[PDB]
Design a protein around this nucleic acid. Structure first.
Ligand SMILES: [Mn+2]
Ligand SMILES: [Mn+2]
Length: 392
DNA sequence: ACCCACCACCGCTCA
DNA sequence: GAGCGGTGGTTGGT
């Protein structure tokens, strides 16, 4: 649920997460804040195979990707007030990356939408579009390839939907969920959408006046709100159930006090725990000894580089040089510079103090495409010299 | 009596 | 959660 909603509101704009990140950083002069429904992982990460704990290993890699994007994420967990990777390990790993874990009192997607409304986050990444019913304005879904590397997302805009052909707004979709559900039998997304379009989605708190209006409209269709008449659809008395109505209208979410607490404490003083990550990966992935250390260095270095650029907003302690420029399609033509750096020097781990058991040398220069905007923010002098040398 | 377009629903598969 | 074909039902007819 809601089944068939995408044929009504649209499938959504497919867009590079990098583009969303960099555009917001340019438009709003600070990194994008994104609430992530923790329920999204449940079917995406238990598809990885091989090695030790591949499910949380997938989680590790998408966290490194979040670093590379410069996104400030907050992962929201479900609460018990709702009407196989460990939560403990997920939260432990979230802290090691300098990210934020947040426990909803009830359903996470309701909390995520609430956080967005309160200006705690700029957008929501969830299983589906249910977030719109809980007040979300910008909601993201399907963080995946476009495949290979997971670079793109599917963006739904609540205002544009309420204007587009469906005319489905928040209270329209509630009525759809009220009548269709998954409650009137024989109904019915098509009819529910037509009922919503007629404006029956208010529901501004003796409600039986309203109920026998559309009930009259469903069987006679004198206003012509429908393609046909529906004398077969017969409506229960409990309906419209009002517990259900305000499960959407005021879902159980964090207290005002919690909101203002988050408002001062998120984003946190984000810092990646290197030594913490080294122990985690050794314990959980069997990334043991010198090979395991080098493996962590290689994977973590680029994101750690991006992350430290923004955090200052000669310092060649980050970028050793620049050599190219591109507007690749994977980022929807977001200007990137080919950047060099020393992985082990940047991560700050010495593979030597670990036992030894073509290849990759963490002490030699590695290359990475980093968004030009982030580089100008973090290493402005090196970028100007690159621009200077290239007008010759 | 029968056709017909539309639709709601079920079972299916992959996440 | 979300895509597919079947299909049984409803509607408005033919
Ligand atoms: Mn949920
Ligand atoms: Mn949902």
């Amino acid at each position: 649920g809601i089944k068939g909603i995408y044929k009504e509101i649209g499938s959504g704009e497919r867009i590079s997460l990098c583009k969303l990140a960099i555009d917001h950083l340019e438009q709003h002069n600070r990194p994008l804040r994104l609430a992530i429904d923790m329920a999204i992982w449940q079917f995406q990460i238990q598809a990885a195979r091989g090695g030790s704990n591949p499910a949380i290993r997938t989680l590790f890699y998408r966290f490194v990707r979040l670093l590379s994007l410069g996104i400030h994420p907050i992962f929201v967990f479900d609460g018990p007030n709702k009407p196989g990777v460990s939560t403990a390990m997920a939260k432990r790993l979230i802290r090691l990356f300098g990210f934020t874990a947040h426990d909803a009192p009830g359903e996470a997607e309701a909390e995520c939408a609430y956080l967005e409304q309160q200006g705690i986050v700029d957008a929501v990444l969830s299983e589906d579009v249910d977030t719109i019913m809980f007040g979300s304005r910008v909601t993201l879904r399907d963080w995946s390839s476009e495949g290979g590397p997971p670079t793109h997302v599917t963006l739904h805009d609540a205002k544009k939907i309420a204007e587009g052909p469906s005319g489905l707004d928040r209270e329209g979709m509630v009525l759809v969920a009220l009548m269709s559900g998954g409650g009137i039998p024989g109904c019915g997304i098509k009819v529910a959408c037509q009922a919503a379009k007629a404006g029956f989605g208010k529901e501004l708190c003796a409600i039986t006046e309203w109920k026998q209006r559309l009930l009259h409209e469903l069987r006679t269709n004198e206003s012509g709100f429908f393609r046909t008449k529906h004398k077969a659809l017969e409506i229960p008395e409990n309906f419209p159930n009002m517990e259900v109505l305000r499960y959407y209208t005021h879902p159980v979410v964090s207290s005002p006090a919690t909101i203002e607490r988050l408002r001062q404490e998120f984003p946190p003083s984000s810092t990646v725990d290197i030594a913490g990550l080294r122990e985690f990966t050794r314990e959980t992935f069997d990334w043991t000894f010198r090979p395991g250390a080098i493996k962590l260095i290689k994977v973590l270095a680029p994101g750690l580089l991006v992350q430290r650029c923004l955090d200052r907003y000669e310092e060649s302690t980050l970028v050793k040089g620049i050599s190219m420029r591109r507007e690749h399609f994977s980022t929807d033509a977001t200007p990137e510079l080919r950047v060099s750096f020393i992985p082990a020097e940047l991560v700050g781990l010495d593979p030597g103090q670990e036992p030894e058991v073509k290849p990759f040398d963490p002490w030699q220069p590695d290359l990475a495409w980093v968004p030009e905007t982030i580089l100008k923010l973090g290493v402005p002098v090196t970028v100007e010299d690159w621009e200077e040398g290239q007008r010759s």
